[PDB]
Symmetry: C3
Subunit: 336 residues, 3 copies
């Protein structure tokens, strides 16, 4: 169908780690689905010792919100760059065809907006990110990425074509940060975004992140802000990394069905311990919880997780199952 | 079935690179398979110039021994932490469901042991590793990991369901080491395990290993200690990396059938040159030897292999095959 | 069949990024396909500020030329090492079985040549590279690698066995370079190849490349030297990385069908945003162009691409398609 003649619908976005309400399988025909995002440059505290990032975001968050459509829909995004920002921006959708993903059609200076339409003709989770000419990696590593999820119109399927269904979706964006230090060994704090540029590029070129965080900060997905679920619930875990490889793992769980390359027309793999998200992509995993407790969800380079920040928690309610796992003898003195 | 009512069997473990005797396809029903491992902290010489590691091991070796069961069996491990060790330990089985892989149920101080049961309900090769709260990567990178192999009850299968069988299995654990240097440019030697901690964490955070070794040392799987096979023999090569990615390759061979993500319910890939083991996982490859000679088996980041240590040898006996490869003209002066 | 009795054919190689003329599906029976390559050591300018590399090449180029045969053919290579070179060399074909890929049969000192035959019995794209004992990574990272493509005799196929066909093939070799600096912070320029060795090995061991280039130089595949195509044309993009992982991406496009592990007997994946080439391998992607414009083809670690050099361009002629993508509103003042 010609998109100029199709019905339009508007979606209200929600902040990560939630995902806006949506259908999996649907009876709906194709639609032009309208979204708006507003760019916010801001200084953010990213660790427990007061380190700051001169950050750049879609809609005030790292990652930007997840956009959900169905295969055959059109995405119609209005991108707003308020006059309170200092830098130009744009958007590159890996789900889109042409014009550098849309970047060439969405160059907005402070004080400007633009509106882009494209056909979501391929199912999967896809990264979107900012990409302004001459300063592409800086904008990405400072926070400007998120996920577009294009569901098959009849929902997710296993390798045999059986239906898969989730009860809740969560979105995790992983950010390799390059925070400069000065000659006193302390991280630098900058008064403006532009002042941070040259020092940051030098750190970038070492390919060694200072921090690697989920969702904007060390510990972002812990404490009051842990993810939640119940025994018997099936969760979809969307994981994006716009710049650098990562290897997700659920401690005490599995990826029941995983699309590590993120593209739903391909059969998923089962029973994964650890999967692989290529830098520049988003992938997705399903898991049905079978045990209660506080799980960790992390990058299984354990230095990247525990030392640099790439780890969160999932607090799961319900009944413990001794068939799956039992403590036969608690820690006690070695028999003599 | 309820595991409390099932038959129990005990397995005697063997040191890497061998794997304890086991059946592939079996007529046996499900069993509770009992294993014991004893933790040993020890100083180890890891290279040819006398560099030492303040190491931590399951059963005295890097990697720990490979445990083999069949899908539907229960693993029942007694983990012993003798009073001669300095640190607490535990075990996280990626093949297990709940309680941080078993880590929350197996916290043993020096002088203690514990016994854990879990259902091996998913087929594949899975990492196990130590994971004590607050010092997880240190224990892993110091040597505390190995493999649990859960075979399908009817043995390994190709994508069409045809049986695959191996004559010999070998287990290779690859260890990214972070050995500190002092201001004189020499590697540090420490009198105790605890003394090595702070300096090691600083090296870890650079994400640059000093050494990357198979099976505990540069050259461990060479010389008298090379792997062996014969023309016509099919080998299973199990490869674990609990912390960091690697890319196995057999020089002059292939991966005939490879499960790089390590999970046997998924179809394998054929004819691989180089495969990929995600940090935090174990994978497996089958190869049938067709040529005699001394092969290398290595990580194909050739700096990681030849400069940092991630390489071994396979010495293969038998008859050379000129149909597969022939020297038509030996090195000689260029025709003039 | 016995290769000694088969017909012989000779192929004239062409320089990257082109690939010599060949058939996809063929009616031909198996042949011994004869090739010649001549090693050239040379100093090369690798960036826009005059940095030089003491380089080593097959046939004068980085990568070496792509060799194309069909499954069941024999490759018969004459490798020439002229007396004007300083170092010994050889070749390791990952497509070959035995004798360290052929390296043990092809050790040529300056002034020598050798001729190797092997059966191309496995379909796929495979790396070939130099590998002289005691200095393997140096020769690889200095430029000595390329691709052998072994096509199925009936051409490429999708997961259902439907024929896939390409109109043009391009070959991209990605090279992680380790150029030393002196105490003044400038890259070193060396009078001879041997003089560069010790300083380069020290840089290698840091695992941090100074540059990461396609086809021998920053910007090699840009400007006059961009790749070209037309709307409606299907291209095969062959990507080799003999030493280090990479993650190819087409900005504004996709991998329609991708063999990321590079082995054509395995089903490809569809709709990829970004794929993964393991260090020590070659992979391949098909794409049919649907939009005109100048695309980027790059490693999607965007620091590796935009800061270190791992990026090229594809200039595509034809008609813009507003159904796939349309600018609904050009950048303009934010409504008040
Ligand atoms: Cu931006
Ligand atoms: Cu991108
Ligand atoms: Cu431990
Ligand atoms: Cu783990
Ligand atoms: Cu060479
Ligand atoms: Cu190789």
């Amino acid at each position: 169908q010609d998109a100029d003649k199709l019905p339009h619908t508007k979606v209200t976005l929600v902040a990560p780690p939630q995902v806006h309400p949506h259908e999996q399988a649907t009876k709906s025909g194709p639609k032009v689905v309208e979204f708006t995002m507003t760019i916010e440059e801001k200084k953010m505290v990213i660790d427990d010792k007061g380190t700051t990032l001169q950050a750049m975001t879609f809609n005030g968050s790292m990652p930007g919100p997840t956009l959900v459509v169905h295969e055959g829909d059109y995405v119609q995004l209005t991108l707003v760059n308020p006059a309170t920002n200092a830098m130009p921006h744009n958007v590159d959708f890996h789900g889109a065809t042409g014009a550098l993903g849309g970047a060439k059609l969405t160059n907005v200076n402070p004080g400007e907006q633009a509106t882009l339409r494209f056909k979501a003709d391929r199912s999967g989770t896809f990264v979107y990110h900012c990409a302004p000419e001459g300063m592409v990696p800086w904008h990405v590593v400072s926070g400007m990425s998120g996920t577009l999820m294009v569901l098959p119109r009849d929902g997710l399927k296993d390798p045999q074509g059986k239906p898969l269904h989730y009860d809740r979706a969560y979105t995790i964006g992983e950010f390799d940060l390059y925070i400069p230090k000065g000659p006193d060994g302390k991280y630098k704090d900058y008064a403006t975004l532009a002042e941070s540029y040259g020092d940051t590029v030098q750190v970038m070129r070492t390919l060694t992140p200072s921090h690697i965080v989920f969702n904007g900060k060390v510990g972002a997905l812990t404490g009051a802000n842990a993810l939640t679920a119940k025994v018997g619930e099936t969760v979809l875990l969307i994981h994006s990394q716009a710049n650098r490889d990562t290897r997700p793992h659920l401690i005490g769980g599995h990826g029941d069905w995983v699309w590590e390359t993120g593209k739903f027309a391909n059969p998923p793999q089962r029973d994964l311990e650890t999967w692989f998200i290529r830098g520049g992509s988003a992938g997705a995993a399903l898991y049905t919880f079978k045990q209660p407790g506080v799980y960790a969800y992390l990058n299984h380079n354990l230095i990247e997780a525990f030392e640099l920040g790439a780890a969160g928690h999932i607090k799961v309610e319900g009944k413990w199952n001794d068939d799956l796992m039992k403590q036969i003898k608690a820690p006690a003195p070695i028999p003599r």
